[PDB]
């Protein structure tokens, strides 16, 4: 028997570090994650009482949009529908949303607008794309936001809710945006997504774009397809398209662009962000191939994080360094590499990569600054890099000293990556 009050009396750092590892899964009727359902010599298959018929007839058609996906093993659903009455009213769940909003959207990610039970209520999805918590906006402003926003007006405003089309049908996109139009809730949403599982966009995408100027609190735009990346957020050489594109006033507002799952961003010759002249961050989430010599990188952006990629080329900094100190690549690798591991190299582990470095004694302190100016000429004022899960970088990876210090570059899942030299 778990005790909620004894949990809610201990202070807020421990509660953050509880709800950071409880990812979003507030329920006991969680689906199995999709790593054991494939790593198995077995297929879990179904094979139904007096009470469960009432729930599957009366509760279930309200939730038949987002929960018909889990029709395999319907013991999951007739376990789910007893959580579905009381889990959104739970004190642990509301405390998780309180310490989420008090730490600015860090703990559990991206509450989502949806339209179920005829209300236009919020929703929370876990990583398995299951709703668990659905709140209408009056209740969400009442008993989680106003329970932590007592008197300071820099915390009453709630502007982190995602929008996330491809969750729901385009007719429901239209009805959701109409009900969102008749209220003054465009400043409530914080980011939008894009789906659509030459220039032929879907109806829901056009409906989303034609009201995107009205937000005035929008950041963090994201798409999910290679046949949709080229159409609205890549420049592509197009300079005049009045309708169906993404309204240059609202290109200025956004902070980052997430690129969810694709094959290549440089399907054409150049994958240029010449516009979006105000974004600071960019996250490549599951793109298969990217070429760092094929992105144009706007005038002041800071972070290029990237994860789950399969092939990286690199900024080919080495080919410009070898013009400077004027050696061959074999002679460079044999003579001008020191591989120093003093103490900050050994702080973050990287037990699979071997971090290397040029010579302080065999380069005479100028053509050393030129060799560093090559690297800062090829980066063009970025700082945060964050290579997660990768494989088989083609060129060698070259990172400057001022950015490899202070943990501003960070290779996390080091399996096939190796030999990052730091200059």
């Amino acid at each position: 028997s778990f005790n909620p009050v004894r949990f809610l009396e201990l202070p807020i750092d421990i509660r953050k570090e509880v709800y950071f590892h409880l990812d979003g899964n507030f329920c006991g009727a969680h689906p199995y994650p999709i790593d054991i359902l494939y790593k198995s010599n077995d297929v879990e298959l179904p094979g139904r009482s007096k009470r469960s018929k009432k729930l599957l007839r009366y509760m279930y058609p309200v939730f038949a949009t987002y929960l018909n996906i889990f029709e395999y093993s319907p013991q999951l659903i007739e376990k789910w529908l007893e959580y579905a009455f009381w889990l959104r009213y739970d004190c642990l769940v509301l405390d998780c949303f309180k310490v989420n909003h008090l730490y600015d959207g860090t703990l559990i990610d991206a509450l989502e607008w949806t339209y179920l039970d005829n209300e236009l209520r919020l929703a929370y999805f876990n990583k398995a794309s299951m709703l668990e918590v659905w709140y209408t906006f009056k209740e969400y402003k009442k008993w989680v936001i106003d329970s932590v926003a007592f008197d300071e007006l820099d915390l009453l405003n709630v502007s982190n809710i995602q929008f996330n089309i491809d969750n729901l049908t385009p007719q429901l996109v239209d009805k959701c945006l109409s009900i969102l139009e008749q209220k003054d809730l465009f400043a409530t949403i914080g980011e939008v997504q894009f789906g659509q599982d030459n220039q032929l966009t879907s109806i829901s995408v056009i409906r989303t774009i034609r009201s995107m100027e009205s937000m005035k609190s929008l950041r963090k735009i994201t798409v999910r397809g290679e046949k949709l990346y080229e159409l609205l957020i890549n420049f592509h050489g197009f300079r005049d398209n009045p309708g169906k594109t993404i309204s240059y006033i609202v290109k200025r507002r956004i902070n980052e662009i997430r690129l969810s799952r694709m094959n290549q961003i440089s399907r054409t010759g150049l994958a240029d962000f010449t516009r979006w002249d105000n974004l600071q961050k960019l996250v490549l989430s599951r793109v298969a191939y990217i070429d760092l010599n094929s992105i144009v990188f706007p005038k002041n952006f800071k972070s290029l994080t990237m994860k789950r990629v399969s092939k990286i080329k690199w900024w080919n900094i080495e080919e410009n360094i070898l013009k400077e100190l004027k050696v061959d690549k074999r002679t460079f690798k044999s003579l001008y590499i020191k591989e120093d591991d003093s103490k900050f190299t050994k702080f973050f582990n990287l037990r699979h990569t071997r971090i290397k470095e040029l010579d302080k004694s065999e380069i005479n302190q100028i053509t050393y600054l030129r060799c560093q100016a090559i690297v800062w000429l090829s980066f063009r004022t970025l700082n945060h890099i964050k290579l997660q899960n990768v494989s088989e970088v083609f060129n060698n990876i070259i990172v400057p000293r001022a950015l490899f210090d202070s943990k501003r570059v960070e290779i996390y899942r080091c399996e096939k990556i190796s030999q990052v030299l730091v200059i």
Binding site: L37, Y38, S40, D42, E44, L45, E71, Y72, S129
Partner: protein, 134 residues
Amino acid sequence: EDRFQELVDSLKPRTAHQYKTYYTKYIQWCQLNQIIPTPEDNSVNSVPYKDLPISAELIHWFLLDTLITDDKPGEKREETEDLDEEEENSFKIATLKKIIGSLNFLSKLCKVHENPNANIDTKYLESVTKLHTH
């Protein structure tokens, strides 16, 4: 377990659970017709991936007997209104493409689990998809 990382990465979680729902319907249809034998009754049946009979004709005959031989022996008569039937067979062709993709994914899952049976011969199902599309 070499290819399981780029197999989960080929899909969303939502699409992976939709596909598991669709081939769970397929394996229920194969067990009620005894194409693959059930291990036991009144117990949780756990059929392997090594010995799952998948072919073009089995997928298409599943598609017949569930999706497009719409018998429904008490509720056939709800195909009168033209707009409702247009939405309903748009739903039929959408679920047709989704079940073909799900069973293609089931074939791709079973070929790595040492099952030499699941060869889809995908031009057959493309001809079926183009037939229903026409």
